[PDB]
Amino acid sequence: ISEITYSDGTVIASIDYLYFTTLAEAQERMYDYLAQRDNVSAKELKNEATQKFYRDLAAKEIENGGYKITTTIDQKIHSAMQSAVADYGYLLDDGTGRVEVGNVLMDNQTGAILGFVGGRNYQENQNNHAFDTKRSPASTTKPLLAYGIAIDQGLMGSETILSNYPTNFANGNPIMYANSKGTGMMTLGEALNYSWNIPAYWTYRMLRENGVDVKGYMEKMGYEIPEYGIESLPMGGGIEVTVAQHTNGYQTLANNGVYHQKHVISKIEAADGRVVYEYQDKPVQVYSKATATIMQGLLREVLSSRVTTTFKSNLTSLNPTLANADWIGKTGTTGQDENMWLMLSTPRLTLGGWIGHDDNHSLSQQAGYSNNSNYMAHLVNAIQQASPSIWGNERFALDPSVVKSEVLKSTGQKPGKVSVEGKEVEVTGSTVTSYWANKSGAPATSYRFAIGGSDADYQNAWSSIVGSL
Template sequence: MKKDNPGSQDKMRRRLEHKVQTKRENSNDGKQKNNDLKRTLSTTFTVIRGLLIVFGVVLILGGTFGAAAGIGYFARLIEKTDTPNRAKMLAEINDIHGVSSLKYSNGQTISDISSDLVRVSVDSNSISQNVKNALIATEDDTFETNAGVVPKAVVRGIIGSVGGGTTSGGSTLTQQLIKQQILGDSVTFQRKASEIVYARALTKYLSKDEILTDYLNVSPFGRNNKGQNIAGVQAAAQGIFGKSAKDLTVPEAAFIAGLPQSPIVYSPYASDGSLKSKANLSYGINRQKIVLFNLYRNDYISKADYDKYVAYDISKEFLQPAAASEKSHGYLYNVVYNQAVEEIYNYLVKKDNVSATDLGNDSTKAAYKAQAEQDLQNKGYTVKTTINQAVYNAMQNAVANYGSVLQDGTGTVQPGNVLMDNSTGAVLGFVGGLDYSTNQFNHAFSGGRSPGSSIKPLIAYGPAIDMGLMGSATILSNYPAKYSTGQDIEHVGSKGTKMMTFTEALDVSYNIPAFWTYQAVLKKDQGAKPYMTKMGYNISNYSIESLPLGGGVDPTVVQHTNGYATMANGGKYVPYYIIQSITDDQGNVIYQHSNPTPVQVYSEATSTIMESMLQGAIKAQKTSKFYSDLQSLNPTLASNVAWAGKTGTTDNYTDVWLMLSTPTVTLGGWAGHDDNSAMTSNAGYINNASYMANLVNAINAADPTVFGSGKQFKDPSTDPNVTKSTVLESTGEKPGKVNGKDITGKTVTSFWATKAGAPTTTYKFAIGGSDANYVDAWSSILPSMTASDTSSATTGSSSGSSSKSSSSTSSSSSN
């Protein structure tokens, strides 16, 4: 209740103080109630009447046509805005969003999303009148008598907007409640027009006390002493002063009533729950003093009380910082949560038409990121993922039961695995590490590692086949070779042997053949860059000589799995994803994944040939016992599924990889130490092979259809896209003449991705190798070829050889 007015001198002093305070606060207009007018006229009539008056003034004063048109346009918007349905409107006003949740692909719950928002709703009797008085005095001093809007304030805002300013300003508490709960805060004439009509309607549907109580229950009030966001006056009272809202004193109520204008700035606590510095605390304390003055100015407190309260140090009442209880989550929760924040961020930016220029501003981007996270936590969103519940759980059980086979006494060996649908890029399951409780780093999605030789099919052999530089029976040089620095190119201690078939080079994963193949690729058009760039690999320098051995490229497991899925998917790249959809608590779709048009990275013929070669590599078991281990565990699974893949091992056995593809899915696997220290020589060939075989068996037990049992990759011998060439086994090229001599012998079929197929045999028939290497090679192929024959032949052209690059070297030898 208001007190009786003091004497005239006291009134004059107050008016002077009010002028000073108004200048400092730059907010409330002079107090004019307009009670009779607002109680007898509808909001629409009142606002339009005010607009017409201003319209006339603008014309008289020579205002612009644009201003007049803008005001008239706004008036028409108000007239055309329908009054909202009472039941629907009240439901929205009283709607406090439910808990957001994450779902598996089958709709089952992964987890509710933890929120740092503490919200407590209370009835009117549980809220101190001190808070209500403080809020009304500061935010809307005509609240008790207005009809939901103050026409003069609305007109002022519209003129400001027409003149290049903003439509904000002059909002009553009722309008603020409408904006928070129904319309949002987009700055448009239509939203403002709706806000006015809605606010007028709400004053008819609810009492003033009900509107005020709703406002106090839904509004944000900054942070509590645990660093948690708080909403509602009860949470604010408990989190800042340690008491109920009904027990707040006038100084405490004034502090809380001042928070909604800028909750985070005025809050006494930082995001970690610590008290802010004295300088930063001053913002909220100064705001409290403004509220106290408004209480005095509006006759809610006496001058004596005002002087007493404004001199009191409210910071003495702030609770001391405390720790918030933390709920532990796992790898899956965090991956999905982070991706959901990204998708909601994109949604908000698009919804608000934020320009690329604005997003270049770090503060703008940070604000939208924070808003996205807040929305995810607090708006009752449902995030549906691509994760197959049965498969994911089986993978977690497998790492718990068989992760021990990776341990070799060199320290904790961590795994990272991703199972991906080849045709859609959907992540069906993954393993982030041995145990989230002891190591939270996600080895499947975070932190790139050198892929070792597992990169060879993607960056060297795949492009070479695609460019028509080689076929399935091409011969490659494995004679000793050096980098341009003079360093030997080695393979597990071996410095080289002789010429060999592509099959042998791939099965054993020799490094020198991959080196020479990549050098040939580098000389063709743009080299491997278009291939790797299309698949999202980040490679800064394509001239690194050891790049085909894993030097200079560090993919994550999920990215590398996506690369292998591309090769298995007919050469078509589809980016991986883990979120299918995000909907709000009203069922509105915030995000819906739509499969993009696949990008053809490798030709279908290249895919067919490469997958055929990789199937042979798995069964050859030269670098991994995976296939025999799987045969022991589940012979049917081993024989009924077309397994294709490649291993990779970096120097000193720092990283071991096994990439497996079937016609339907790709399973990527990495293992190693977080500190990049060495493992034993059994890490890949034995340990990771056994672990991966058990993982595959567990996945199959959970979903027998996932690996595509009974399905086959395309057969290069029947694929119409593949060219079949009859070539000499010794040269990998068609029979022909070299230096006048017929070159004949055993022939085989070589599969090529280009229409021309294999070339005719030339003296330098292989990929790579020196002149001396060819002299030696021909001595085995055609002993009758004399030294003079070979001498003259070395001056001829080569179909596939390449010289060493002078580019920089990054050492990485691998299997």
């Protein structure tokens, strides 16, 4: 009778979060294997009755067969993660009841899942918040769906300027962030650190205007998103993901643009040793190396800046060496504080983390900012203790293909002549290196130098700019 092992061949069980997660995945691979073995047509496989039967026939196969199921799970690491959430999960409770939690640690280079947190305590609550739970990824959407795609397309670079000026949705309601209706122009860096919404709204809207196949990108990463025609899409509206699937997105950015499909099972072998399933590596360059490495740079500072997450502070206090790893990441917070995300990467690993309530009520305001950040610092340390060089010491680095431009700070763009209602101006001032992922680098400065902005906005910004020579 059959076995599931850790990656080193150590038996997990013969046929708790660990048990069911790995088994359910093994059964899903067994389901595929049998449907292909019986030549079940794709029409047939859509049939509900057929699915039940084959779901049931895969389950019995594992029980009765004598298969070895090799998982990707690292015993020391996964176990250290269980202790972590046991020891430190209480840091999440903030007076809104018992806060649940999902984490997935993924190898950036393989997609393998080394260990995971399923929830506060399987014995109290059996919902798997790492693999099953689907929640809006909120602002963690932005680097993937908006900004990363805009850069990859050549429509934006590291120090391009976006409008966070007040603006409304089609219905007339103001696009909000926290309680702000917006401010003014702003670099991509600042838009990312503070997690503004308006800048993301204009970015997505620009992608639609340029006809960019955004679905194409998201699908290459395994994202199932049913409707792309949504103005708040890039802020995580109309999207729902597992922590495992979402971790896979950040795995893509971290792995210099190259997707590896997540997996928890690497091999199933019949009792006579014939492989019935084995994981096939299909790297996929979702973003250009320039794009991914440019994005790595920005997400480095999302964490450094500490604007929306205290994480680096927390990690520094618990483990100052570890804190010097080249961490990058992105927070998410849903509009009523229903869900907090913190996504973290070093060159080697990605660790995704969600918290919230099962019934979807609000957390405290600081639940993502402080609590989750603190918790994940403890979790990241606990993985370190268990496997001391697993995080690695590599730095993320700009790909040589990255083009570097001299732009004005004020416009995001090369200095140049511009007309400001009549009066042409020679536009001059302090400059910055901007990183682009196109052939040619930044354009020269135009009147509409920014992503988004009304006319009014533009004669307000140009006002100050002109003032400032």
